[PDB]
């Protein structure tokens, strides 16, 4: 088959024409694809390259990622800034070799229960600056190897209790720029390896005695938007006074 016949997306043909500079043995020689900000609409045909391990698809206009369901040798998946709207269920269940998943700045409205649960090898998950209002109960519980979790810039109304249960290896948790009023008691008490937490720019209801006590105990993992260590950055709603000061 020619370049034009396997891939109906103009841009996606242009990137498979650039990678190889075709035979199925040729198509089975493709280990990575770098095709970011390349004006791409659908990856129809990406199912015939089962040995691809690295996939750079950020900055494109994807709606459906259905054709990646079986690519079982993937480990890096970067889909930052596309047009994804909701996440089909089980679509990640087969990517059990993923270590890093970047769903940065899409239009995702919600997460189905247990969509990540077949990704036990993940260390990095970027869901920041989407449109999430809430999170499936213990969605982050099969994700035991998770070193960084980014959620900032959403409209998160509230966090499930123990939602961060099986995340001992977590070192970086990002929550700033959310519509958070309070956190479950003992949501963070198991986050043992946590070295960076981001909590500023949240309407902290200080009506707030667990978080006020968790921050003083860990008065060195909180960082403001500039990077400097700064625990007075989580400000109470209305008053504007720092949380840790109550």
């Amino acid at each position: 088959t020619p370049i034009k016949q396997i891939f109906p997306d103009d841009a996606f043909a242009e990137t498979i024409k650039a990678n190889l500079k075709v035979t199925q043995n040729e198509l089975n020689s493709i280990d990575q694809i770098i095709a970011n900000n390349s004006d791409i609409k659908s990856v129809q045909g990406i199912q015939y390259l089962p040995n691809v391990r690295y996939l750079a698809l950020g900055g494109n206009k994807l709606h459906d990622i259905s054709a990646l369901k079986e690519l079982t040798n993937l480990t890096y998946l970067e889909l930052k800034w596309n047009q994804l709207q909701i996440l089909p269920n089980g679509v990640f269940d087969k990517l059990t070799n993923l270590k890093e998943l970047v769903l940065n700045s899409n239009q995702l409205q919600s997460l189905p229960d247990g969509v990540f649960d077949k990704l036990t090898n993940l260390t990095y998950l970027n869901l920041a600056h989407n449109q999430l209002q809430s999170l499936p109960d213990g969605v982050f519980d099969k994700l035991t190897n998770l070193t960084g979790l980014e959620l900032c810039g959403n409209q998160l109304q509230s966090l499930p209790e123990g939602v961060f249960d099986k995340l001992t290896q977590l070192k970086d948790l990002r929550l700033y720029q959310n519509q958070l009023k309070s956190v479950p008691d003992g949501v963070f008490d198991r986050l043992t390896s946590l070295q960076y937490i981001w909590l500023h720019d949240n309407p902290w209801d200080c009506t707030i005695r667990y978080l006020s006590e968790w921050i003083n105990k860990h008065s060195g993992v909180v960082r403001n938007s500039a990077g400097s260590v700064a625990p007075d950055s989580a400000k109470c709603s209305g008053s504007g006074k720092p949380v840790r000061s109550i």
Binding site: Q32, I34, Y54, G58, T75, N126, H129, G148, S225
Partner: protein
């Protein structure tokens, strides 16, 4: 009005005890006043600096601090200058699947042991991307008489380099043990240390 964008120093993204930063640089530009907006991953930030200014060279610079592991994670940094219309430019860590560097240490040529000081070399081949740190050290303290070549593209599509540390042959021939330390994203703990002695 020419604008450029320069990536942080690998020594800073891998040592963490240091603050990395991305340096935006505008030259050419009478009107030496330029507004700088910054964006990480498509979202605006305001934490950036600006240094005092500097043919009539308009070397006005804005530096922006890297948060934690944002660089290695693959965040994209965009600088936007204004007076023309606004000129935007983006910079990001090199895309591609990382590869772990091999570090081998290589003692001085016998033919060099005729000279007041000998050369110890550290070969680091097959890493990706080229962002990498290399330093030397002896018995607990660090050395400092070393130079490190820049990454070089290899036949297999990865990088290699060498660091040459120079010591007094009296110090090599005594059997002292020097250590080549190397910092990259594909190394456990971002870190490996190789040693060589007589």
């Amino acid at each position: 009005p020419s604008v450029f964008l320069f990536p942080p120093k690998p020594k800073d993204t891998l040592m963490i005890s240091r603050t990395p930063e991305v340096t935006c640089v505008v030259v050419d530009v009478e009107d030496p006043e330029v507004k700088f907006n910054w964006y990480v991953d498509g979202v605006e930030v305001h934490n950036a600096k600006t240094k005092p200014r500097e043919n009539s060279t308009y070397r006005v610079v804005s530096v922006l601090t890297v948060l934690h592991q944002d660089w290695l994670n693959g965040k994209e940094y965009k600088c936007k200058v204004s007076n023309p219309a606004p000129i935007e430019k983006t910079i990001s860590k090199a895309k591609g699947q990382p590869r772990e560097p091999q570090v081998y240490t290589l003692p001085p040529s016998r033919d060099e042991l005729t000279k007041n000081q000998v050369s110890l070399t550290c070969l680091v081949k097959g890493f990706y991307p080229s962002d990498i740190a290399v330093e030397w050290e002896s018995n607990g303290q660090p050395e400092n008489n070393y130079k490190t070549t820049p990454p070089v593209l290899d036949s297999d599509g990865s990088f290699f380099l060498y660091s040459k540390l120079t010591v007094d042959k009296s110090r090599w021939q005594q059997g002292n043990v020097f250590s080549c330390s190397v910092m990259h994203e594909a190394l456990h703990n971002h870190y490996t240390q190789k040693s060589l002695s007589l």
